[PDB]
Amino acid sequence: MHCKVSLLDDTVYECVVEKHAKGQDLLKRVCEHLNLLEEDYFGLAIWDNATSKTWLDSAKEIKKQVRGVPWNFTFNVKFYPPDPAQLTEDITRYYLCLQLRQDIVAGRLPCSFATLALLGSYTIQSELGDYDPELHGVDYVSDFKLAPNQTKELEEKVMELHKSYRSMTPAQADLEFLENAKKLSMYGVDLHKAKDLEGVDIILGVCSSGLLVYKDKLRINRFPWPKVLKISYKRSSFFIKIRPGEQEQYESTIGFKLPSYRAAKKLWKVCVEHHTFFR
């Protein structure tokens, strides 16, 4: 079968697997190679579109997962590292920046004008290299996707910063971008729309920390992983259970209701994965 994987840099990789090819376990392992990635496990994992993602299950044939859908996927970071500097290679940081940049442009990682212009500049180093007036036209950055909005005023601050960067290697520019993104709240946060037993339109969020609840803003709640003993669902109901923190005896079980059992099994699936990838 002919696969079409949309790579992190708006590039399409194309290949062919046998009809009974196991999930990403094969397609993804294949994708790893093309990118010469060593640290597979991390974020890096593949999925198919439709508003919000759905990770191609790595242990099941690809065929079942795409019934009534073309064999098209996207290579992505599935598990964002808390501290990227701890990662072993730079290619890895290279792709992580590619992802975050992906996130930044689609408002998946909102941030200020400063933060944007900062990260923007480091992106310009990485991609371009030391200023050098060959990066002609006092408007060279105007070709990059640095911000969802993308205002000239923002570009200026970048070019301003880019110029002060000299002899900055790409790996360095990347680590500075990462040390900064690392800090943003929302970094590596899978947002899933839901509701709480009260009719309240809340928003769950998954990440290395644990389960996060939102409402307009308010990090309403935050259930850390080692502070979780069970995750489950029944129809459109999602359920996390255990430890109220202080009051012993108590072993709460907060529940939320997703639009469908599909949504819930999905969230349930992601959650079990994260809780397992991070101590």
Side-chain angles (χ1 to χ4, degrees):
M1 289 277 326
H2 182 65
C3 306
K4 261 176 166 51
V5 184
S6 166
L7 296 185
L8 277 162
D9 61 345
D10 304 354
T11 277
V12 180
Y13 168 66
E14 294 186 48
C15 58
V16 161
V17 279
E18 67 175 66
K19 58 184 297 185
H20 305 302
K22 202 91 135 66
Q24 52 187 189
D25 183 48
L26 307 187
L27 213 196
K28 199 186 65 301
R29 186 66 193 181
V30 158
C31 212
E32 304 312 31
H33 296 352
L34 214 257
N35 290 319
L36 205 276
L37 267 172
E38 215 73 299
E39 313 192 77
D40 295 50
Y41 306 172
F42 291 111
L44 298 345
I46 33 186
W47 61 259
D48 40 64
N49 52 296
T51 298
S52 287
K53 43 183 181 168
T54 324
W55 300 107
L56 204 202
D57 194 311
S58 179
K60 308 178 191 167
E61 309 183 332
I62 299 178
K63 192 181 216 301
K64 304 171 175 181
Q65 318 202 215
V66 298
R67 296 179 298 210
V69 158
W71 292 50
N72 299 347
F73 313 96
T74 66
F75 181 85
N76 292 92
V77 166
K78 182 196 196 179
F79 289 149
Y80 299 60
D83 179 47
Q86 212 50 54
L87 285 170
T88 304
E89 305 178 315
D90 308 46
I91 6 168
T92 316
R93 282 147 210 146
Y94 175 72
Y95 285 130
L96 216 197
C97 287
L98 278 189
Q99 181 63 82
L100 300 179
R101 297 175 49 182
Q102 213 58 87
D103 300 337
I104 281 173
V105 186
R108 197 166 312 129
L109 213 200
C111 53
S112 63
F113 185 88
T115 307
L116 272 176
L118 218 220
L119 303 160
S121 67
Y122 291 133
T123 283
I124 300 305
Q125 252 305 288
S126 304
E127 286 290 313
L128 301 181
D130 295 309
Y131 185 65
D132 182 316
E134 83 179 299
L135 280 48
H136 306 299
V138 292
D139 66 308
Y140 55 111
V141 177
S142 66
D143 281 1
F144 285 89
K145 299 170 181 180
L146 304 185
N149 52 285
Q150 275 287 167
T151 67
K152 289 77 170 182
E153 184 180 305
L154 198 230
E155 298 192 316
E156 321 304 304
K157 198 66 186 189
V158 184
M159 285 186 231
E160 170 179 343
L161 299 147
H162 175 42
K163 300 162 187 294
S164 74
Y165 303 160
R166 282 282 189 167
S167 83
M168 166 115 71
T169 58
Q172 294 173 162
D174 274 353
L175 225 309
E176 275 312 286
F177 176 111
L178 297 184
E179 286 303 330
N180 279 300
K182 195 223 302 192
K183 283 146 63 293
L184 285 172
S185 48
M186 293 300 83
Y187 165 85
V189 162
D190 211 353
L191 287 180
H192 300 226
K193 279 197 173 188
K195 216 111 62 166
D196 155 65
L197 304 190
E198 209 71 64
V200 272
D201 276 37
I202 62 81
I203 289 184
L204 305 184
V206 201
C207 66
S208 50
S209 305
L211 236 183
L212 331 184
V213 184
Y214 296 67
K215 182 178 300 171
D216 314 290
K217 290 291 193 56
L218 280 291
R219 296 193 333 83
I220 292 187
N221 226 308
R222 194 215 131 184
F223 324 88
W225 300 119
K227 209 76 175 180
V228 177
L229 285 205
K230 172 186 180 179
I231 314 177
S232 60
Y233 71 110
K234 195 266 197 67
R235 282 310 99 58
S236 66
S237 77
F238 173 59
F239 297 125
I240 38 185
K241 325 173 187 181
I242 205 59
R243 293 317 325 173
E246 209 64 302
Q247 65 267 288
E248 223 60 11
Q249 283 294 74
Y250 291 54
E251 285 201 7
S252 197
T253 291
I254 313 75
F256 309 80
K257 97 90 60 181
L258 295 67
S260 76
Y261 73 85
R262 194 174 279 171
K265 187 179 177 178
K266 177 157 156 187
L267 180 59
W268 169 68
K269 211 150 156 45
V270 194
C271 285
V272 184
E273 295 183 314
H274 279 255
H275 169 276
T276 300
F277 188 73
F278 308 96
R279 174 63 293 178

